């Protein structure tokens, strides 16, 4: 269900059309436990036109690869061979986020 | 004693000086019953430079604090929060780590 700014607490889908530099986001962790969470969101880039991944969203699989104990190089490797259009299930974690950034 | 790759079957102390972006290692488990597993050493990293780890190292503590039954985010927290250098006992369980990780 929502949490309290509006967005789903639970594993959402979210559907991004690859542009000319990429997905548009960055992503730290993957490394001490720590998941695969967005960290920024490029201005006019296609995440951003997209407007549903937040800072603090954990990226738990894409296209059928999970990515909840991947190491940070697997995550980059897995994002970069998506493809065009790329499924993305996020979790929002802003707390836990926090926590370890 | 020494196990049958030069590694020690009991639980071994090992401490590790923080890098750049942590410890070099990466770890699994912390439900179901299943404890925490190291499943990646990172190339280069501290953890691989120390030599003292390895994948299927149960980290059975961190600084004092039992891990043997936490979550898998409370032992990433116990990981993130423990300092530059981090005092680890871990117990190497190659065999039960492929039966988990199956």
Same mark, same amino acid.
């Given at each position: 269900g929502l949490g309290e700014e509006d967005i789903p607490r639970e594993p959402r889908r979210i559907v991004i059309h690859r542009g000319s530099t990429g997905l548009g986001f960055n992503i730290v962790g993957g490394e001490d436990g720590e998941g695969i969470f967005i960290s920024f969101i490029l201005a006019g880039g296609p995440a951003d036109l997209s407007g549903?991944?937040?800072?603090? /969203?954990?990226?738990?699989?894409?296209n059928g690869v /999970?990515?909840?104990?991947?190491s940070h190089e697997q995550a980059a490797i897995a994002l970069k061979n998506a493809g065009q259009t790329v499924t993305i299930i996020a979790q929002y974690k802003p707390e836990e986020y926090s926590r370890f950034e």
């Open positions: 549903e991944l937040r800072k603090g /969203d954990q990226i738990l699989s894409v /999970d990515l909840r104990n991947a």
